[PDB]
């Protein structure tokens, strides 16, 4: 299964952010990350651990070992707000609870 922390993530434009997930058994590197922009269906960002899909910009990167995997956004841009979900498919195909990224503004 999966645990995603943190639940909410206030971040300023330009800032970096990190979201992580943990699992209950060893899952090699089989892990994806989804972005569900508001009012839309989710979309893929990284799969099999760390592997930018063919339209995702390189500000997103993935990493992780054993049971903990992290998604990193180096420079947060406006389009990146919404709820992120990790999806883990080494053992058996489960989603993390979600981390809502909100843009800190004036």
């Amino acid at each position: 299964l999966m645990t995603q922390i943190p639940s909410l993530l206030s971040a300023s434009v330009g800032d970096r952010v990190t979201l992580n997930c943990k699992a209950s058994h060893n899952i090699n590197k089989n892990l994806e990350w989804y972005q569900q922009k508001l009012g839309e269906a989710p979309k893929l960002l990284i799969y099999y651990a760390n592997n930018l899909q063919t339209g995702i910009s390189s500000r997103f990167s993935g990493s992780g070992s054993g049971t903990d995997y992290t998604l990193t956004i180096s420079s947060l841009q406006p389009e990146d707000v919404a709820t992120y979900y990790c999806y883990q498919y080494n053992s058996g195909h489960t989603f993390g609870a979600g981390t809502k990224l909100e843009l800190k503004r004036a």
Binding site: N30, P42, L44, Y47, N51, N90, H93
Partner: protein
């Protein structure tokens, strides 16, 4: 499609129309999102065409497909209040030497409401 309002215990069949890729070389999966935004895996088939479900819907939901007409089906039976949610279908990929684990979207949803 196939969604709508539901009285508890009812039955319903959702569909999912795929295009440009065929179901003969692609797999499709059912994932829902409840109103409190939580995402759940409903049902899956392997590359060998074997099916699996979680306990939650085990025995009630029945995933199926038509490689000819390019259709994916979800036949929910004995609906409960907790099945209320948006239902999506996705194709799975793997490119990595292992299980085709990740459900890659292409569905726009279809809201089922059990009340």
């Amino acid at each position: 499609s196939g969604p709508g309002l539901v009285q508890p215990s009812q039955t319903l069949s959702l569909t999912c129309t795929v295009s440009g890729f065929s179901l003969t070389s692609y797999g499709v999966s059912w994932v829902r999102q409840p109103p409190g935004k939580g995402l759940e895996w409903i049902g899956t088939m392997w590359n060998d065409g074997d099916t699996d479900y979680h306990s939650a819907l085990r025995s009630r939901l029945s995933i199926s497909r038509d490689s000819s007409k390019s259709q994916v089906l979800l036949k929910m039976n004995s609906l409960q209040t907790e099945d209320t949610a948006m239902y999506f279908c996705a194709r799975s990929q793997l490119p990595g030497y292992n299980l085709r684990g990740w459900f890659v979207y292409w569905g726009q949803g279809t809201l089922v409401i059990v009340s």
